[PDB]
Amino acid sequence: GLFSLDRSYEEVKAAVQQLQTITFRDATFTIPDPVIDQHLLIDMKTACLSMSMVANLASELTMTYVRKLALEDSSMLLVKCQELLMRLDRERSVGHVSPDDEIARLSALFVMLRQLDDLIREQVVFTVCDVSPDNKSATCIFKG
Amino acid sequence: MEANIFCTFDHKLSIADVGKLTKLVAAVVPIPQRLHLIKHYQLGLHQFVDHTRGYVRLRGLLRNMTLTLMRRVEGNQILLHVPTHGLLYTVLNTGPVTWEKGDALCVLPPLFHGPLARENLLTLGQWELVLPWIVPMPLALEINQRLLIMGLFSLDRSYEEVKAAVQQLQTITFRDATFTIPDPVIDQHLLIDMKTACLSMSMVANLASELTMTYVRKLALEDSSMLLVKCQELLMRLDARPQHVSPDDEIARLSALFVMLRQLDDLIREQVVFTVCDVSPDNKSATCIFKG
Amino acid sequence: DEVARTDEWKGAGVSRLREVWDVQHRVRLRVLWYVNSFWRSRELSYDDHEVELYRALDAYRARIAVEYVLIRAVRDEIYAVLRRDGGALPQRFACHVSRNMSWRVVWELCRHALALWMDWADVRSCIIKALTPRLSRGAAAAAQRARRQRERSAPKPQELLFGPRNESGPPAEQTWYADVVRCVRAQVDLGVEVRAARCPRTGLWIVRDRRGRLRRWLSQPEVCVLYVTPDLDFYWVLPGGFAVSSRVTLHGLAQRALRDRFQNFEAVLARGMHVEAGRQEPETPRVSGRRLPFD
Amino acid sequence: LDKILNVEAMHTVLRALKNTADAMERGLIHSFLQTLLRKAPPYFVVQTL
Amino acid sequence: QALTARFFVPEGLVEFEAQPGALLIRMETGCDSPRHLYISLYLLGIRASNVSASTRCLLESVYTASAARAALQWLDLGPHLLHRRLETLGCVKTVSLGITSLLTCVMRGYLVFALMIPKDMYLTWEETRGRLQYVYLIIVYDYDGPETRPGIYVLTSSIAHWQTLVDVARGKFARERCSFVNRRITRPRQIPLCTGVIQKLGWCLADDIHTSFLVHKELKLSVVRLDNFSVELGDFREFV
Amino acid sequence: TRCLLESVYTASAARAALQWLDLGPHLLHRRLETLGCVKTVSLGITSL
Amino acid sequence: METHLYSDLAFEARFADDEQLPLHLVLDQEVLSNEEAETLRYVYYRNVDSAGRSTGRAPGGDEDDAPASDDAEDAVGGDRAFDRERRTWQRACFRVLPRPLELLDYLRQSGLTVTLEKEQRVRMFYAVFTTLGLRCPDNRLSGAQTLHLRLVWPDGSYRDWEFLARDLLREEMEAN
Amino acid sequence: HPGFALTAVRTDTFEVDMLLYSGKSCTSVIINNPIVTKEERDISTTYHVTQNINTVDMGLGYTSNTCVAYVNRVRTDMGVRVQDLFRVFPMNVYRHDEVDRWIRHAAGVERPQLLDTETISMLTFGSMSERNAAATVHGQKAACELI
Amino acid sequence: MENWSALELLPKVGIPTDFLTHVKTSAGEEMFEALRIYYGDDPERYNIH
Amino acid sequence: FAATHNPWASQAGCLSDVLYNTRHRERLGYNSKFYSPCAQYFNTEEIIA
Incomplete structure (x- = not known):
């Protein structure tokens, strides 16, 4: 879904062609594209843009909130986290806020991550202990 | 397993109190120790409630405890039944929140409501019975998220600026109802949660791939829609062929991003306790599956 | 493979340690210098041209000047209004008086008290405490509300009959801050807090402690x-409840320095204190050494 | 007293069974009427036919 | 009641595991002929950083079979990840030895059914004995060294709600979390997943915990034991 | 107690009596007279 | 200890935008009592120009320079002036060690390999760690600058005292 | 006069008392004995009973006629209030931001304020775009569409 | 709160009657002084003191 | 469905509310004896109750 917008370049075409297939314990598949007719569906669009939005919002918000929280009892986790952020800022940059806009930003970050909960958690529903050449059939314990 | 819990009232049981308690049959009450026999003091949250100290502390103390169902009563004897994972049970709505078919439930400490005239149950002497709130997933998730938002925003600000933001945040509207968080004072538990949130947020900020970083910019250049207009309006204050494309590294980086987002979600999502079948039309009772 | 700043920081370590006093030589504290600090890499320059130093000390003198000059303005008001009245003091604080007393000796004691109090003037004195709430944000709004409320027409019978009840007026119980000086043994008290009220029988003042007990000094001959x-x-009061009246002419000072020196500093939220405004704070955080620290 | 409660339980069973029988008969007639209206064309078309 | 299961495993892996009460894990492998291979918790001790030198020497002495050594080579081949390759089966009590051995496992039941843990691997966050205790299997990744060797623990606690347990684990394992951040910064081309993984399997009465010794081939090991045990498997849940 | 009584008696008719009590020059002594003790209720817009 | 490192990194971050350089302080029983050191809440610092100014106010001048009006309504420009005064103060991180310790042994138990000009032992019954900044409008730093250190306790009481930059930097900067 | 004319189409609902006419034995019903199954919860048990009838059409052509008889009253106001395409097509926006804002303001329609899961769900999957009106004496609003 | 269990347990007099509107509407629209409504079966009647 | 047909008579703060509403009228000189014809059309408090 991420590659959907850059699908013209040859490198992207080869990468997505490679990404189409999965191999798993003697079986090989082709997973159909989420894109149809050169455009992307609204549902995949909103999922992908929500994930991109939460990543982006975290990028800016992290500096202000690590500085603010570290005003309390600072710890090693905080200082190494801040150093990691400093390294990110150093490599990226080669070339105040309104309180209501701030609260909107936090609400947007959490609401964007919140809808992603649908897909991220791969809940288990079955566990199996039996197998046969009848492989069409199996005996399982119910879960979830 | 201790599939039954007996509780004994030390005080006398007047006819009015025993009838009132008879109306509560099959409701939900928490029990700390899970021991076979328990006194009447631990039945309910009254032993642990304290408005002077954090609602976060009460939230933690409630989420740690165990859940039980009610059974019909007799002289000086009240019977509590612990549910077994996976079976089907009947529960009654303790709070005023509306319940709907096919959505999960969570347990949370009580909330202030419109009239503030909360009914008192079994006020035996200086002791009182108070029930926890059984809440459907959206409202519970919203309130826990907004409490964390309160903690993260209010820090290192004067009371004057905080005063408007707290009145904007504290009020929750959910399915035609209104609610307010009782006492959102910062506590060390909230500071630990906030430290974990900051670490996870910085990690996802760092290890996110370039395509994820630049995706919304490219699409905002490409398309134009109400959702994208809102996203740009949010990011407006902040506002080519990729030189490297690597499917395997992208897969691994996105897996790391998923473990980070999975961790960040756990800070908000309270553990499910009930999943519902269809509900009685009076919104007072429902039949549910119990999960642990 | 590269190390983080933290590990090379801890390896490089510190090598210097200096002790520095404050300007008044009240308190001494140490400073540490880290060899790996970015402050070294910046290569900034330093100079202390003497005219800038002289300006800095003169400005510092003007900074400590704020309260002593206010004390002296209080002196000037006292003497000026004493001259203007021409040696007449009306009674203002409720206490009985005796006629057959050598009033000259208590006048001389008033002179001695005036001399003694001024020698012991300090920032701890009453008037600094009096300005302390005046500077805060709530003071301006409260003064506006009070002026609007006191400058009000008597309600018509219509308003009294219907709607809201009589709107609450000001309470009689006032809060004052005070200095008391005793001449029998030369010693002063400078940071007092006191309750005040207006006597119902006669409009004179009654002074009481915050515990409610009636205060005694007004009778004592040796105290002003x-x-x-x-x-x-x-x-200003001398024995016998005879007083001198003036208003503190604080207009001699610039607002910038007056606000710079002192104000009732408003707080920001920290661990443990309520997010709702004005709620009762839980037990103090107090990271402690008397006990094994919690983890 | 326990015989009173036993009679009450038996009568509850009887009420439930009789009410359910009435319910089933009403449901049968209701479903028959539903089918009969799903077949029946409007007046003007059959008058023309 | 109990949900019995049946596995086959070659003789080389069995001899120390052959004591009736043991815990078994399934490991995936990239090699095509041994698609899956079965490993007991004791065998993880040979690689676990928590295990002391003497117990590691004993484990190296016992598991010298070629198939077991190949299994350990497959385990060590995994780059800085094991929970992606390990899956928990449950407690076992029955064994028949031979050139290919047969043993049964129970994935849900409480039908002696003691579960055995090595003394090196056992820890508790609390010294007060709570009447009701849960027990969990956790894997923790060290990052301060040159390359990541994993830590292994099995722990008992009175905490049931997951987020509280994650809070206490973060409190006690802060060094490992800082090491994970240090790994992320020091080797930016490498991307570790987690600091540790929690997995739930436990329901037992605290008064029925025992300390004991165990023997095999006249070699002596110290172990901790859960006697009146019940097994309930769960999902590998990752924490930071 | 005065605040409680002021809150409870805030009906329209009561405040008129309070106005009449202090709108005249004369003291309470000349204005009032006692009728002993009351012992029944019959509520309405006018009560007996 | 960690406060010094974190504050150094944070001031490295903010230097490109507001040009403050970091200064690291340690305080002992000559500064404050054990009771008030155990309950320390806030620390605040400010910088002053040579002629007498502040960091938050406009350097040229401000309406605050006008004489006080002593009127009834607005004593001293209440809301705006108080906002400016709270603006000019700045907060810094702090950590307090309530147990008694000596500096050199504690630092060597930490990762810092201290090698002083002489191994002068210092004994502090209780120690608080704090980092403060002093600003230079450009890479020229004037010794006549004065620095403020404020400490705040929950009940609203506070104590403060001023330093001369020439005393703090008397030899460390002279080498460079 | 904008230079083009519009014709609106409108939907109105009525509540009526229908009557139908049937022929004797024009359709047959085949029914069973009702079968009961048992379900058992904690405090209460519920029995489900079903009787799966099936019907056969016992007549060629049409054996049942119905005539809609009586108008009880109208539920729709038969008004001319216009359907908001902004509600029907909430996703679409004008390319330039300022002109879109000005059109939305001038048209008397309000854009959503803040991002929330309810707003995201409304935009993506569709929901009740507008709340209930404050009050209604004139029945259900007549949804008017225009060509 | 009235003793509804007494109403349920005790014998009754059988009176055929019909409300002007639908029965559920008369209860839902608050026309009666006091109401007790339950769906399914409330076991409260079987508990007596 | 227009906003109002009488701007000076409909709004809460307009002439016809402040003049006619018996609860607002009490803020001004009001002889209660006169039955104002439009009193029942502007007692917003009574109508809300």
Whole structure:
């Protein structure tokens, strides 16, 4: 879904062609594209843009909130986290806020991550202990 | 397993109190120790409630405890039944929140409501019975998220600026109802949660791939829609062929991003306790599956 | 493979340690210098041209000047209004009086008290405490509300009959801060807090402690006492309840320095204190050494 | 007293069974009427036919 | 009641595991002929950083079979990840030895059914004995060294709600979390997943915990034991 | 107690009596007279 | 200890935008009592120009320079002036060690390999760690600058005292 | 006069008392004995009973006629209030931001304020775009569409 | 709160009657002084003191 | 469905509310004896109750 917008370049075409297939314990598949007719569906669009939005919002918000929280009892986790952020800022940059806009930003970050909960958690529903050449059939314990 | 819990009232049981308690049959009450026999003091949250100290502390103390169902009563004897994972049970709505078919439930400490005239149950002497709130997933998730938002925003600000933001945040509207968080004072538990949130947020900020970083910019250049207009309006204050494309590294980086987002979600999502079948039309009772 | 700043930081370590006093030589503290600090890499320059130093000390003198000059303005008001009245003091604080007393000796004791109090003037004195709430944000709004409320027409019978009840007026119980000086043994008290009320029988003042007990000094011949109101009105009292009245002419100072020196500093939220405004704070955080620290 | 409660339980069973029988008969007639209306064309078309 | 299961495993892996009460894990492998291979918790001790030198020497002495050594080579081949390759089966009590051995496992039941843990691997966050205790299997990744060797623990606690347990684990394992951040910064081309993984399997009465010794081939090991045990498997849940 | 009584008696008719009590020059002594003790209720817009 | 490192990194971050350089302080029983050191809440610092100014106010001048009006309504420009005064103060991180310790042994138990000009032992019954900044409008730093250190306790009481930059930097900067 | 004319189409609902006419034995019903199954919860048990009838059409052509008889009253106001395409097509926006804002303001329609899961769900999957009106004496609003 | 269990347990007099509107509407629209409504079966009647 | 047909008579703060509403009228000189014809059309408090 991420590659959907850059699908013209040859490198992207080869990468997505490679990404189409999965191999798993003697079986090989082709997973159909989420894109149809050169455009992307609204549902995949909103999922992908929500994930991109939460990543982006975290990028800016992290500096202000690590500085603010570290005003309390600072710890090693905080200082190494801040150093990691400093390294990110150093490599990226080669070339105040309104309180209501701030609260909107936090609400947007959490609401964007919140809808992603649908897909991220791969809940288990079955566990199996039996197998046969009848492989069409199996005996399982119910879960979830 | 201790599939039954007996509780004994030390005080006398007047006819009015025993009838009132008879109306509560099959409701939900928490029990700390899970021991076979328990006194009447631990039945309910009254032993642990304290408005002077954090609602976060009460939230933690409630989420740690165990859940039980009610059974019909007799002289000086009240019977509590612990549910077994996976079976089907009947529960009654303790709070005023509306319940709907096919959505999960969570347990949370009580909330202030419109009239503030909360009914008192079994006020035996200086002791009182108070029930926890059984809440459907959206409202519970919203309130826990907004409490964390309160903690993260209010820090290192004067009371004057905080005063408007707290009145904007504290009020929750959910399915035609209104609610307010009782006492959102910062506590060390909230500071630990906030430290974990900051670490996870910085990690996802760092290890996110370039395509994820630049995706919304490219699409905002490409398309134009109400959702994208809102996203740009949010990011407006902040506002080519990729030189490297690597499917395997992208897969691994996105897996790391998923473990980070999975961790960040756990800070908000309270553990499910009930999943519902269809509900009685009076919104007072429902039949549910119990999960642990 | 590269190390983080933290590990090379801890390896490089510190090598220097200096002790520095404050300007007044009240408190001494140490400073540490880290060899790996970015402050070294910046290569900034330093100079201390003497004219800038002289300006800095003169400005510092003007900074400590703020309260002593206010004390001296209080002196000037006292003497000026004493001259203007021409040696007449009306009674203002409720106490009985005796006629057959050598009033000259108590006048001389008033002179001695005036001399003694001024020698022991300090920032701890009453008037600084009086200005302390006046500077805060709530003071301006409260003064506006009070002026609007006191400058009001008597309600028509219509308003009294219907709707809201009689709107609450000001309470009689006032809060004052005071200095008291005793001449029998030369010693002063400078940071007093006192309750005040207006006597119902006669409009004189009654002074009480915050515990409610009626206060005694007004009778004692050897004591003269100083009062200031929360609206910066001024009183000086000698034995017999005879007082001198003036207003503290604080206009001699620039607002910048006056606000710089002191104000009732407003707080920001920290661990443990309520997010709702004005709620009762839980037990103090107090990271402690008397006990094994919690983890 | 226990015989009173036993009679009450038996009568509850009887009420439930009789009410359910009435319910089933009403449901049968209701479903028959539903089918009969799903077949029946409007007046003007059959008058023309 | 109990949900019995049946596995086959070659003789080389069995001899120390052959004591009736043991815990078994399934490991995936990239090699095509041994698609899956079965490993007991004791065998993880040979690689676990928590295990002391003497117990590691004993484990190296016992598991010298070629198939077991190949299994350990497959385990060590995994780059800085094991929970992606390990899956928990449950407690076992029955064994028949031979050139290819047969043993049964129970994935849900409480039908002696003691579960055995090595003394090196056992820890508790609390010294007060709570009447009701849960027990969990956790894997923790060290990052301060040159390359990541994993830590292994099995722990008992009175905490049931997951987020509280994650809070206490973060409190006690802060060094490992800082090491994970240090790994992320020091080797930016490498991307570790987690600091540790929690997995739930436990329901037992605290008064029925025992300390004991165990023997095999006249070699002596110290172990901790859960006697009146019940097994309930769960999902590998990752924490930071 | 005065605040409680002021809150409870805030009906329209009561405040008129309070106005009449202090709108005249004369003291309470000349204005009032006692009728002993009351012992029944019959509520309405006018009560007996 | 960690406060010094974190504050150094944070001031490295903010230097490109507001040009403050970091200064690291340690305080002992000559500064404050054990009771008030155990309950320390806030620390605040400010910088002053040579002629007498502040960091938050406009350097040229401000309406605050006008004489006080002593009127009834607005004593001293209440809301705006108080906002400016709270603006000019700045907060810094702090950590307090309530147990008694000596500096050199504690630092060597930490990762810092201290090698002083002489191994002068210092004994502090209780120690608080704090980092403060002093600003230079450009890479020229004037010794006549004065620095403020404020400490705040929950009940609203506070104590403060001023330093001369020439005393703090008397030899460390002279080498460079 | 904008230079083009519009014709609106409108939907109105009525509540009526229908009557139908049937022929004797024009359709047959085949029914069973009702079968009961048992379900058992904690405090209460519920029995489900079903009787799966099936019907056969016992007549060629049409054996049942119905005539809609009586108008009880109208539920729709038969008004001319216009359907908001902004509600029907909430996703679409004008390319330039300022002109879109000005059109939305001038048209008397309000854009959503803040991002929330309810707003995201409304935009993506569709929901009740507008709340209930404050009050209604004139029945259900007549949804008017225009060509 | 009235003793509804007494109403349920005790014998009754059988009176055929019909409300002007639908029965559920008369209860839902608050026309009666006091109401007790339950769906399914409330076991409260079987508990007596 | 227009906003109002009488701007000076409909709004809460307009002439016809402040003049006619018996609860607002009490803020001004009001002889209660006169039955104002439009009193029942502007007692917003009574209508809300």
